[PDB]
Amino acid sequence: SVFSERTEESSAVQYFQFYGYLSQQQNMMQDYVRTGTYQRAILQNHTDFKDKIVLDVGCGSGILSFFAAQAGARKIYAVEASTMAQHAEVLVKSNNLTDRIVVIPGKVEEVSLPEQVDIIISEPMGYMLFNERMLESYLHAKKYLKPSGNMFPTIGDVHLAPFTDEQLYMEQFTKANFWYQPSFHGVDLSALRGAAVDEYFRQPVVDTFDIRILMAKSVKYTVNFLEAKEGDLHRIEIPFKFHMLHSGLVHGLAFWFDVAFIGSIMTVWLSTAPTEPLTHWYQVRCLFQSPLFAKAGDTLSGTCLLIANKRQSYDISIVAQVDQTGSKSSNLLDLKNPFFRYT
Amino acid sequence: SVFSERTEESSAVQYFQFYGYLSQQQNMMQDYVRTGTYQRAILQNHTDFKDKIVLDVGCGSGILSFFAAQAGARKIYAVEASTMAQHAEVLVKSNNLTDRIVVIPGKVEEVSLPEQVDIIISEPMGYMLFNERMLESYLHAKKYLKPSGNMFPTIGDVHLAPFTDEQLYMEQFTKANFWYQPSFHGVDLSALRGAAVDEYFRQPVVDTFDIRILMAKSVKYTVNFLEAKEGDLHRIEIPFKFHMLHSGLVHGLAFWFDVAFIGSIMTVWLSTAPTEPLTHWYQVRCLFQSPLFAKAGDTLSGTCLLIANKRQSYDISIVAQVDQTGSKSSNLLDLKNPFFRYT
Amino acid sequence: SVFSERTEESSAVQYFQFYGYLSQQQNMMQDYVRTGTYQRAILQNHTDFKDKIVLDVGCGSGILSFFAAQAGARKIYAVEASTMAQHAEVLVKSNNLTDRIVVIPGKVEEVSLPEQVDIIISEPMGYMLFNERMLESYLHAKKYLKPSGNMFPTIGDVHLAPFTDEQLYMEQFTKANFWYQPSFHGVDLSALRGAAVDEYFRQPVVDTFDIRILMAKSVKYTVNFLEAKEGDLHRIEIPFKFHMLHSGLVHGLAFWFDVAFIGSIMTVWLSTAPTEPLTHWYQVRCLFQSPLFAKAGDTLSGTCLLIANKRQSYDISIVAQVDQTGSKSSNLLDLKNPFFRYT
Amino acid sequence: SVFSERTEESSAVQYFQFYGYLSQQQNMMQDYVRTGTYQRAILQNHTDFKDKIVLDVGCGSGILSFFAAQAGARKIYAVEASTMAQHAEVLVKSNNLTDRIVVIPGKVEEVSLPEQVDIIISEPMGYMLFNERMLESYLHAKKYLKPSGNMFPTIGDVHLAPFTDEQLYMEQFTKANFWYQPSFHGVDLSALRGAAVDEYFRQPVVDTFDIRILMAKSVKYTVNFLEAKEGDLHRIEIPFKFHMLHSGLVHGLAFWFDVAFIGSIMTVWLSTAPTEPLTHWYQVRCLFQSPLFAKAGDTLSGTCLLIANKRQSYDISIVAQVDQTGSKSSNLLDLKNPFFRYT
Ligand SMILES: [N-]=[N+]=NCCCN(CC[C@H](N)C(=O)O)C[C@H]1O[C@@H](n2cnc3c(N)ncnc32)[C@H](O)[C@@H]1O
Ligand SMILES: [N-]=[N+]=NCCCN(CC[C@H](N)C(=O)O)C[C@H]1O[C@@H](n2cnc3c(N)ncnc32)[C@H](O)[C@@H]1O
Ligand SMILES: [N-]=[N+]=NCCCN(CC[C@H](N)C(=O)O)C[C@H]1O[C@@H](n2cnc3c(N)ncnc32)[C@H](O)[C@@H]1O
Ligand SMILES: [N-]=[N+]=NCCCN(CC[C@H](N)C(=O)O)C[C@H]1O[C@@H](n2cnc3c(N)ncnc32)[C@H](O)[C@@H]1O
Ligand code: NA
């Protein structure tokens, strides 16, 4: 299958074991912003669902399918690969919806659907939008979508912006300098200080922050799920040119994302921006190895390159330079192993 | 291989990826009780190491091998399966011990050692002692041990005792009660209330607690690492009979462990008991879905059964009953998925 | 008679037996807020009593009749159905008011009065205002009222507001959890877990609380005793629409009431609101079996339905929903069987 | 029926309504002394039950029947008059004992049982043992007992003892003196002070107390349930002659009771004495209207006469005199309406 070919079995087992727990589903369901915004998107666009055929990619507990049913859907195919599928089936029965919701256990890349659908719904967003690589399953599911079809969400925007945060930056060295001592219980650890530094800096930092640390207006990279193909997400190149609003040291790039549900009646937005109420996605920060000094009015230009790996994540390569000075910085990050800093 | 036959590949990959991070090594090394006690055990029994051949099973960063070198070992074979093996090599060179410490990358079940050894050292204890199933690698390594050889640690004691803690019980029930709702965003979840309770109550609670919650003197189960065989750890049956010292509700069983290093010069103990300074193992509690009432003087009897699974952990079945009343509680726990309650 | 047709004799016997005790009369008289506010209402409106004919419905000890006598009433007919009527007569004689207070033993629905009256006084309010169904006797007594006559109290307001109180909810669930035990002295009780939850949650909680647990401004339901008929109190339907001021879990609805004495000289209010000094009515809370999550700005809508029963009480049906999400809770309560939660 | 003839319906309705609540059943079941002692008496006398026919009078939840089943009874008839019978039926099914336990809804005086039984079990004791008058149903049930049959409990002992408690005695007047004021809000209440005193002294006090208030060895009145007739409980005359152990003022009589289960293997005692752990029966105290002074060694003689009434209770007539001084005191009390004073 397309899924097994892009994924190490080891990663997949862990991934679907994770989503097999009711507590994790609960975690997602109790994110009011997420769940409520999906419900609003679906219900306020009832004409996109009423008496339509629907596909729910990765239904988990099945909540989105129930929202589609509330909006009047004729038939909902709810596809789910973890054991949560058996729990979803139990809820479909106890809510008297077996004639309208059909739970299909398995991977959307491997199961068979009996008919084409009018609309696809899913919640495939991970950290930085792309983490977990579920967007590829979502786009893959388009093989079942009528030419007339719609996608909820319809588009996804990744926002990038430079930030300054001296304490976050210094924390890394404070942690790594544990290894810079000549006699830890009689052992000289210092030879591993460099490797410890590299490791800490390879971790994206998951948490939220005050918007005042942002030093320029964000740049946006848009994915149109109606047009995009799977292959488009294997290599993501995000060029950027920031016009600095404040003078100072840029310690890295902050990432967040929006998705939009573009229905017949209205467009509904779900945002994880630091200006918005907090979600279980928080925001993501990637540090530079070396901070860059920029004056207000200067331009910070470069590229963020995301390369998909078989651990259902991305290798992140960020290169930035201040155009007025030629000062340059790189970093390589592994999105699979983030540092959860939120307290 | 003996390891691959008892272990799911998915589990092993993740497992050895975890110990591949320097930050985790740092976490472990910075448990001063652990590191300091190991060093004390080794150095105060230096005559057990002087001019001897040593095997260090799962050396990680290599700290125990360095302690064995400090104690005068002639040769130390340091076996490690994760990528940490390459970092250990760097420390062996920068500490000028290439003539004494030999890092052999790989699983102890799969490598070949050039000679038999006088002593085996390792730190194979997980949560509740047995988690991670590293004790089996440790015992497996005995094929390289001379008939007169020693093992550090030499024995392990598991301690069990009944506790009362309404707040913990209620904290978990509060989480499970989510699945009781008859109309979460218009969806009836209650059909999964039973499944949710089961899941939450399958989580061992890892943290520390005040010793005043204990309702009887603890019971001891001892494993002698010098005499025990690998196969002995596939099924571990721990009988218990508590004489209740206080009247009240027993909400579950508390678990901790001691290990002893029995050297020629002296015996050194490493304890994770709640009467002792805290370690990174904390203590482990298993909750009952329904507490048992017992009066002072009553007897609380039963068995804690551990069955090894292929995810490098154990399925735990705890059965306890008040002998005078027949009030009985059975419980199932998944040691692989603990609730870390320390903040 | 109207009383016997709407009342089981079993309830009536116990009811008038209760009020036959001097200790209960004492308990009520020592509610200083009640007694003081009544005296103040009557004396500050002395012109509504001066040389008037008065009917006191359910005089008990006769205290209100004495207030009416102090205010200059020409004649007071004091109707009382319990044996307390003989004690009231003793007080009338020892206070030398035989020429102004006439005790009429019996039920107000059954006795015969020699003339029509200018004003009716009573204290017919029970828990949640309507409990004991004495308001119907009070309204029934209007058959004796001259066309322009007055009533003290004149109007009653029921106040409803949503509250959050995890502690109370978990206390009740904790009590119900007894019936969840799978081996109580060797007996499985869990088949009755559902019934136990229902029973416990059918109890209104009588007590006071901090006003900060309220999550929205209260809603008002008004009964005008001058206009209302008996039959109006057989089915009381109270619609509500709350605008949530705080985000959180709504565990139920809080109830209290105000009554107003609208006299010629001034209007005097008697309040049992939690913002006011405590009375023997306290306040009443009705728990949902499952709490509802609402965010600030959401609207919580529904109905509180009170159905009069033959046990001199009401069956309470509460249906509430968060309008933005469809999250819904229905609940049934037995006002006859309250849980008195005190010190 | 015998029950209907000795009980006014109102009392019966309230009475069986009371036991219709799971919370009340729970209250009784959670008395560990009571339930544990019954379980012990039954199980430790297993030869009295194994392969026998059993009648359980007023089974409530059915707990005693289950104990009889644990002990090996062949067939158990569980008679229960309140609605609790439907709940007992549910537990019989869910414990897979429908083949052994038959639930019979109704009063034991009114139902028809098919066969004679080898043993009758019940828990018919109320306050002062005799309150609620359920012992008469217990004795009535002997019409179904084989001539060689047994009764569990087999005997009941009521204990009487003189006490001194200045505070309690004084409390009565402190409460009654509320009425002794010439202007309670302008009303002279004093004419009712005498009636108020009389009322308070007619109430037995239910609570526990320190055994140091007891002034003599208790006197015992024994009822042998195997020999006794129903009619023996209509009028209970308890003569007493106390030998004073301490000098002081006797303010009244304290009451408690024991029951004994006399089986083939052993005799098991259940005690509600103040020297024993507290039960939900507490103890009962009845005041003298006038305290009696007694010297150590003096004799306090007289009679306690209990007269059964139609409210499923007793009128209590106590007459006492100090023989050496001729000092005499009496009181008459209504056991149906006790004053619950505990904490
Ligand atoms: N951070 N975050 N949230 C990330 C979203 C988590 N989750 C959403 C759950 C539910 N829709 C809800 O909104 O409540 C995704 C689910 O999709 C499943 N799933 C993943 N891939 C596949 C696949 N290829 N075929 C079938 N199913 C798959 C997973 O097992 C998950 O259960
Ligand atoms: N909680 N806790 N602490 C549990 C102990 C963690 N850890 C000890 C680390 C080291 N002592 C140090 O502190 O330096 C276990 C290590 O052994 C390795 N390891 C596991 N099994 C094998 C195997 N079969 N063959 C080779 N090596 C193996 C792992 O990779 C780890 O590196
Ligand atoms: N909760 N609360 N507080 C509510 C307290 C109510 N209580 C007020 C006592 C009096 N105001 C005082 O304070 O002195 C009611 C009395 O009216 C009598 N009464 C009830 N119904 C009838 C009836 N249909 N016909 C005649 N009399 C009746 C009862 O027997 C009581 O004695
Ligand atoms: N403790 N205590 N208080 C006194 C005991 C309360 N209760 C014990 C409950 C149960 N056995 C247990 O041990 O849990 C008595 C029950 O008997 C019933 N009952 C009363 N009289 C009759 C009658 N004449 N015919 C049928 N049944 C009757 C009542 O309805 C009660 O349910
Ligand atoms: Na030992």
Contacts of C30 in chain D (CB under 8 A): 178
| CA distances from residue D268 to D64, D66, D271 in whole angstroms, order as listed | 15, 19, 10
What protein residues have CB closer than 5 angstroms to ion ligand 5?
B 222
- The string over B172-188, giving b where at least 16 C-beta atoms fall within 10 Å of a residue's C-beta and e elsewhere, is bbebbbbbbbbbbbbbb
Q: Is the Cβ pair C325, A39 closer than 8 Å?
A: yes
Q: Can chain B be said to touch chain D, i.e. do they have 3 or more Cβ pairs within 8 angstroms?
A: yes
Burial tier of C317 (Cβ tally within 10 Å: 0-12, 13-18, 19+): middle
Phi, psi (deg, nearest 5) at residue D327: -65, 130
Contacts of B208 (CB under 8 A, 6+ apart): B274, B278, B282, B283, B342
Which residue(s) pair with C307 in the sheet? C235, C315
Indicate which ligand has the atom closest to the C-alpha of B338: 2
Which residue(s) pair with D239 in the sheet? D303
Rg (CA), chain C: 22
What's the CA-to-centroid distance between B157 and ligand 5, angstroms?
6
- Using what technique was this structure determined? X-ray
Third-level CATH fold of A1-153: Rossmann fold (3.40.50)
DSSP D63: H
Structure tokens at D340: 């619950």
Structure tokens at D249: 């003022």
What's the CA-to-centroid distance between A132 and ligand 1, angstroms?
10
End-to-end CA distance of chain A: 40
The helix or strand, by DSSP H or E, that contains position D221, with its residue range, turns out to be strand D219-224
DSSP D252: E
Contacts of A196 in chain B (CB under 8 A): 22-23, 26
Position B290, amino acid:
S
Binding pocket residue ranges, ligand 1, CB within 6 Å? A 3, 16, 19, 25, 28-29, 58-61, 63-64, 79-82, 84, 107-109, 123, 126, 134, 137, 281
Q: What is the least distance, in Å, from the CA of D35 to any CA of chain B?
A: 9
Disruptive mutation site among D32, D37, D39, D40 for chain B (greatest number of B CBs within 10 Å)? D32
Q: What is the DSSP string of D235-280?
A: EEEEEEEEEBSS-EEEEEEEEEEEEEEE-SS-EEEEE--TTS---T
Which residue(s) pair with C161 in the sheet? C254
- Pick the closest to residue A196 from B218, C272, B87 (CA basis): B87
- Pick the closest to residue D81 from D152, D153, D18 (CA basis): D18
Q: Is the Cβ pair B184, C327 closer than 8 Å?
A: yes
Contacts of D104 (CB under 8 A, 6+ apart): D77, D78, D79, D80, D85, D111, D113
- Pick the closest to residue C308 from C126, C145, C144 (CA basis): C126
Compute the distance between CA of residue C33 and CA of residue D281 in angstroms, rounded to an integer: 37
- Catalytic residues of C, by residue number, are 31, 123, 132, 280
Out of C19, C55, C86, mutate this one to test ligand 3's pocket (max ligand atoms within 8 Å of CB): namely C19
Q: CA angle A160-A161-A163, nearest 5°? A: 140
Q: Is the Cβ pair B295, D32 closer than 8 Å?
A: yes
Task: Give the residue whose CA is nearest to atom 25 of ligand 1.
Answer: A107
Which listed residue (D56, D118, D132, D165) is catalytic? D132
A interface with B, Cβ–Cβ < 8 A, is 8-10, 13-14, 21-23, 26, 29-30, 35-36, 39, 63, 66-67, 70, 87, 90-91, 93-95, 175, 178-179, 184-192, 195-196, 199-200, 337
Q: What is the least distance, in Å, from the CA of D196 to any CA of chain C?
A: 6
Please count the other Cβ atoms lying within 10 Å of the Cβ belonging to residue D300. Answer: 23
DSSP B178: G
D298 Cβ below 6 A of ligand 4 = no
Cβ–Cβ under 8 Å, residues D159 and D269: no
Structure tokens at C159: 């106040």
Three-state DSSP class for residue B85 = helix
Beta strands at C53-57 and C117-122: parallel, antiparallel or unpaired: parallel
Compute the distance between CA of residue D161 and CA of residue D251 in angstroms, rounded to an integer: 11
Domain coordinates of chain C in residue numbers? 1-153, 155-343
Q: Ligand 2: which atom is nearest the Cα of residue B62?
A: 14
Position D144, amino acid:
Y
Contacts of B325 in chain D (CB under 8 A): 36, 39
How would you classify residue C157: left for phi > 0, otherwise alpha for psi between -120 and 50, otherwise beta? Answer: beta
DSSP C218: P
Q: Find the length of chain B.
A: 343
Disruptive mutation site among C250, C293, C323, C325 for chain A (greatest number of A CBs within 10 Å)? C325
Contacts of B293 in chain D (CB under 8 A): 32
Please count the other Cβ atoms lying within 10 Å of the Cβ belonging to residue C229. Answer: 11
What's the CA-to-centroid distance between B124 and ligand 2, angstroms?
7
Phi, psi (deg, nearest 5) at residue D59: -70, -15
Three-state DSSP class for residue B312 = coil
B123 is catalytic: yes
Indicate which ligand has the atom closest to the C-alpha of D123: 4
Position C207, amino acid:
D
Cβ–Cβ under 8 Å, residues D192 and C83: no
User: What was the resolution (in A) of this experimentally determined structure?
Assistant: 2.4
How would you classify residue C199: left for phi > 0, otherwise alpha for psi between -120 and 50, otherwise beta? Answer: alpha
Three-state DSSP class for residue C294 = strand
Tell me whether residue C36 is annotated as binding. no
CATH, range A155-343: 2.70.160.11
Q: Is the Cβ pair B324, D32 closer than 8 Å?
A: no
Compute the distance between CA of residue D61 and CA of residue D69 in angstroms, rounded to an integer: 14
Q: What is the least distance, in Å, from the CA of C261 to any CA of chain B?
A: 43
Cβ–Cβ under 8 Å, residues A282 and A206: yes
Q: Is the Cβ pair B325, D70 closer than 8 Å?
A: no
Tell me whether residue B80 is annotated as binding. yes
Q: What is the least distance, in Å, from the CA of C297 to any CA of chain A?
A: 14
How would you classify residue C189: left for phi > 0, otherwise alpha for psi between -120 and 50, otherwise beta? Answer: alpha
Cβ–Cβ under 8 Å, residues B64 and B71: no
Helical ranges in A45-182 per DSSP H? 63-70, 84-94, 134-140, 166-176
What's the CA-to-centroid distance between B184 and ligand 1, angstroms?
19
Please count the other Cβ atoms lying within 10 Å of the Cβ belonging to residue A16. Answer: 15
The number of CA neighbours under 13 Å toward the Cβ of C90 is 17
Helix-strand-coil percent breakdown of chain B, rounded to 5?
Answer: 30, 35, 35
Residues of A at the annotated binding site for S-adenosyl-L-methionine? 25, 34, 58, 80, 109, 137
Binding pocket residue ranges, ligand 2, CB within 6 Å? B 3, 16, 19, 28, 58-61, 63-64, 79-82, 84, 107-109, 123, 126, 134, 137
Cβ–Cβ under 8 Å, residues D108 and D58: yes
Which listed residue (D227, D276, D280, D323) is catalytic? D280
Q: Is the Cβ pair A23, B179 closer than 8 Å?
A: no
Compute the distance between CA of residue D249 and CA of residue D318 in angstroms, rounded to an integer: 17
Cβ–Cβ under 8 Å, residues B225 and B138: yes
- Does D153 sit behind a cis peptide bond, omega within 30 degrees of 0 on the bond before it? yes
Nearest-CA residue of chain C relative to A44?
C324
At what angle are helices B193-200 and A22-29 packed, to 10 degrees? 110
Helical ranges in D45-155 per DSSP H? 63-70, 84-94, 134-140
C interface with A, Cβ–Cβ < 8 A, is 293, 295, 324-326
- The string over B136-166, giving b where at least 16 C-beta atoms fall within 10 Å of a residue's C-beta and e elsewhere, is bbbbbbbebbeeebbbbbbbbbbbbbbbbbe
Q: Is the Cβ pair C94, D190 closer than 8 Å?
A: yes
Which residue(s) pair with A222 in the sheet? A157
DSSP C217: P
Tell me whether residue B137 is annotated as binding. yes
Three-state DSSP class for residue B36 = helix
- Catalytic residues of A, by residue number, are 31, 123, 132, 280
Contacts of B324 in chain D (CB under 8 A): 36, 40
Helix-strand-coil percent breakdown of chain D, rounded to 5?
Answer: 30, 35, 35
Contacts of B185 in chain C (CB under 8 A): 325-327
Compute the distance between CA of residue D140 and CA of residue D134 in angstroms, rounded to an integer: 10
C28 Cβ below 6 A of ligand 3 = yes
CB pairs under 8 A between B and D: 9
| Candidate from C66, C67, C90 with C-beta closest to D191 | C90
